[PDB]
Amino acid sequence: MREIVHIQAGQCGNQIGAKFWEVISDEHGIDPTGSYHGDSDLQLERINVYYNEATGNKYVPRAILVDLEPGTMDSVRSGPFGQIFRPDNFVFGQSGAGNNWAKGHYTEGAELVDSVLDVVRKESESCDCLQGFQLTHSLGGGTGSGMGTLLISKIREEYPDRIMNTFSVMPSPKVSDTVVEPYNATLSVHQLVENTDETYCIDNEALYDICFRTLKLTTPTYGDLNHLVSATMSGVTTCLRFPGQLNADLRKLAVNMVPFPRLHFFMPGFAPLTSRGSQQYRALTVPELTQQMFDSKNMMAACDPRHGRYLTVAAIFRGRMSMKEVDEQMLNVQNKNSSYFVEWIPNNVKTAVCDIPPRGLKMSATFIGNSTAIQELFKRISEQFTAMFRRKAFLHWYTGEGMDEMEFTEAESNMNDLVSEYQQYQDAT
Amino acid sequence: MYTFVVRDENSSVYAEVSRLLLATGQWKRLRKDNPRFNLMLGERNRLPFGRLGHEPGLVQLVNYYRGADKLCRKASLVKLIKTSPELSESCTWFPESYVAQNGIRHLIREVFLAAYNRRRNVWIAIQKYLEKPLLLEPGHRKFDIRSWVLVDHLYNIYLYREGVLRTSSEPYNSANFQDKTCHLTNHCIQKEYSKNYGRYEEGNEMFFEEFNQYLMDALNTTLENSILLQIKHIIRSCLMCIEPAISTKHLHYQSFQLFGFDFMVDEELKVWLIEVNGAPACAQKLYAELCQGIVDVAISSVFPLADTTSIFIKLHH
Amino acid sequence: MRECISIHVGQAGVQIGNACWELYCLEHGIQPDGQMPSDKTIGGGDDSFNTFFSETGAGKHVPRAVFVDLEPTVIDEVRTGTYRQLFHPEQLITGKEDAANNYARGHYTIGKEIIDLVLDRIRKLADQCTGLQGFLVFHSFGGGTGSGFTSLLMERLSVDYGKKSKLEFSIYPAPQVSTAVVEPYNSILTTHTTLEHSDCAFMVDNEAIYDICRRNLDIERPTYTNLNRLISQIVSSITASLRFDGALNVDLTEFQTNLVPYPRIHFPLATYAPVISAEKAYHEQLSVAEITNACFEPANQMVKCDPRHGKYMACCLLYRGDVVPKDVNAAIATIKTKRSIQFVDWCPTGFKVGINYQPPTVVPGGDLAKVQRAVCMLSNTTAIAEAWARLDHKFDLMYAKRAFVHWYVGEGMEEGEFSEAREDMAALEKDYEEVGVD
Amino acid sequence: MEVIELNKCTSGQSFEVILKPPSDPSLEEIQKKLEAAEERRKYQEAELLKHLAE
Ligand SMILES: Nc1nc2c(ncn2[C@@H]2O[C@H](COP(=O)(O)OP(=O)(O)OP(=O)(O)O)[C@@H](O)[C@H]2O)c(=O)[nH]1
Ligand SMILES: Nc1nc2c(ncn2[C@@H]2O[C@H](COP(=O)(O)OP(=O)(O)O)[C@@H](O)[C@H]2O)c(=O)[nH]1
Ligand SMILES: COc1cc(C(=O)c2c(C)oc3c(O)c(OC)ccc23)cc(OC)c1OC
Ligand SMILES: [Ca+2]
Ligand SMILES: [Mg+2]
């Protein structure tokens, strides 16, 4: 039970983070009180990865809740599983970040950062063999973007040999809070490129389109968006939370998925797409699960895989199913579409199977793709960035916090540098 | 959908097989170095047989037999016939051979001299041991017979019912060995040195209908009985001899191959084996028919298409 | 009586070691508590089974074995499983964090921290030996520990035990049931570093075992348990000459003498007898001729390759069951007439035959049926170089982009060790062509 | 084809049949390589910390 330390930062970070803890606590049989009332030993055999075994025979999430304003965190404590969390692990300021990356990274966030590291360090002390850290946050805001990346930077300083893993929600004008979101995202991507081992690119554009175009939800809330994120986060953490043949961990994930250190941004995808209300009763066949999971309509980053090629792929099937069928269907997709997989990485698709399905479904599959097509997301962000940066528009929000234009030009060019690296391997043969 | 790659860009017959497979709508061509193929149209040299048959979920087939070079190289064919008991020191249909034009002595080895020293004539190093070639007296000319043979993954021996006769254009002279044209019926030496390439038949290629008709009018025999029976034997003999060495019956990958057999028919209607070519070109008229036979027999048999006679003669065992 | 120490490194080595020692106990009549009622000399002895088992005053027969992994889960299953009492706890050595499928991390950063302790526990066994022969080392090519730590251990064994033989049982990576994308790198790195320290290495390609289980045991998706019980049957055949009374391959040095005429070409091909399903409701027992002919079918080899397109430098037939020399010779005469068996010409065309009258043993509730006669053929054929070509190609595909190389350079390796390793492999392939192709 | 070196015992037999006749670094060096890699590793770690320092 190599332990993971969880960190959620900002409105998005905590709301998505809270849903994650709701989903997995149900999977592991943990009620909001904190005690285990389930039916199988498999739920507990690897409970230490995400939970401390507190005194009194209770399980406490190894989670640190961080924000620069108290609003979203007070609502998490009021939430259905808000009790589950440790109260000392709530660390908040009161001035907010005003959707300003500079406020989170350099000023307001700087008052509060050491307060958070003290809690992170307390949780790592009691860890027998820490894997590393997983952070949930958005890149378009101020706290989870600006301070989340500052946290990442400080944690790398103190824990340079542990894995840094993030779930990073990318901004989209279709779900836009603010015009300066391309600024905040571009600055944070520069950080994630340097100081992260694995990032799941959760694009709100993709989340919106799935609710609109697929689940037939006409006006989708952040709730409907976060239902997709919570189901994905449960899927990609399946091999960490349940016994498998792989004995997977965060380092072996990075070793096998990241052929080049900077190219560590993954496209996630999920099983059948499901809305919160609709409980549809036909279980999927293994061909359907495989076809759907590689479908662009099931990706959580708004990119078409047929516009790039896969460097590496990790797929996780949940439920009782013939693993011969799983093997036959997965070899079918690679053999039938070999043009969309790089030929210079043999056996670059790894599939694992887990016999316990997620709640409400009897069959499921989670997709983790390292595709050069993710460059579409990054140059979409940088297009929105340059459109207002060539006029230096809204910069005063950031220069009033001490930043210079020069730092914007450097983050811009490093993300354009990121795009060029994905491009060189999409055409490499 | 099926899958194949091309690694011999100079093959005329597998360029056509490529066109046909694509035109079925059920075969797709990947880039050459993609390992996830069903069919490899491989190189003619240093083909990597050791990398075939190790892809999970793929049945892999290749248009070459590993080890067939021992029949298709001049030097090894002589050592194969002399060493295989199935063929023997006494093989009535292979010209006497021990280890570029022809003449008498002076080369250009111990055992060679003694046989040549047991004489109380002509040699080559289209062979000219047979100074009695057999004349095509509507011009008094020499020829050679090329039969194309296909051996599938089951090691059935399929002889294409259409063969070609590459002919010399001008009369044969028993003392003109420095003059290589009138009795070396290679096509490339016949378009350059020759005197009237193309008078008696087009392209110096007489097919079997015209030739069998000639045998009936001129010698009261047929091509089937006077020549092809012997040809069928020589093909059946050579390929059955090396079958334990090259068969892929119980292998992780499968092999087929199309061979070209060069024959020499002497004046007494006896057939001689000249050469076996492992990467043979084909006559232009017959390309469409033969390459369609390769697909039906060698490729579609392993990789069948959806549900919607024969141009080969099966040489049995 | 000259003792042999087995060393099992990484998951694949440990779990194959379990299946082997389980088989050894059944073949010698040793109980899971370590007692051996058939042994009437108590507290010690110099019997042939003592090559692999020491004896305690309490009558307990303990394997001369060391299990080492950089991570505790797999060896923890040994300490709790059926054979807890079989092993001294100090023989089961675990670290705290594995090599993360990374040769560099298994050989340098993590392995350097545990090499000294393993060597001492290894030496604690050697000091119990009156005449130590050498080591049998079980490991995977693909794992971070089985590749990186094994090579580190092999070097230090050569300095500390300079005059002792070292044989390998190596698991060659197959995508069918592999673990990591970088297994071609780890295989090439460990092979290059271990080549000059290994006297004889029996490679087992997981693809061959997997398909043998699919075809001959009718197991749809073979598990590691399925694979390891079959491998142990092959391993037991190879090592039976060490643990039973016999004249052939009695000591580790004789494996080199009989199988390895050139030190670098020391990868003999193993082909095994009949593999028959226990579930098969009616089976016809195969004669001596049928199982000996089966040794020349690629479907039964531990590595898929075509011996018809190489040359043999040595051939050993290891029989178990009802087999007499008359039948063996008759079967060899028949086979030579119909099969492509050609030796290098500086070697006599001949087979070395050993026969153990005890038929193969099968684990109760296993997948293999009880058979009346079996054989393991060890041939040293250049055809096994096909496996090196296969592996070296996958290495080349990834290294051309320097893909994943940063993970190794990040643990202290230089990029030059990659190309230094690949060049040794290229030289290995050239050697095989020199000996085997005209 | 002849049998050679036939040895019999109660456990089994063994023989040879011939069809046709024929026609390391020091402990000082291992320590050097292992520590040259720890220095190459500690250097890159120092580059990271000096970079995080700026
Ligand atoms: N035949 C067989 N192969 C195995 C077994 N376990 C793992 N392998 C193979 O070994 C390779 C992976 O190496 P492992 O032994 O699992 O890794 P390791 O030696 O424990 O080193 P780490 O990376 O630190 O875990 C893959 O190619 C697997 O197919 C086994 O029990 N039997
Ligand atoms: N998917 C999702 N996105 C969110 C949520 N809340 C905010 N966002 C996105 O995050 C960005 C705003 O960041 P926010 O988390 O509110 O900033 P912060 O509180 O200062 O860290 C915008 O692009 C929003 O679309 C949420 O609950 N779910
Ligand atoms: C942390 O989450 C995961 C880790 C691993 C993993 O540790 C890998 C191991 C042990 O070998 C691999 C591998 O070979 C890969 O090839 C693409 C990818 C990942 C791996 C595999 C996963 O899914 C298959 C995971 O997602 C749930
Ligand atoms: Ca005793
Ligand atoms: Mg907000």
Ligand SMILES: [Mg+2]
């Ligand atoms: Mg391990």
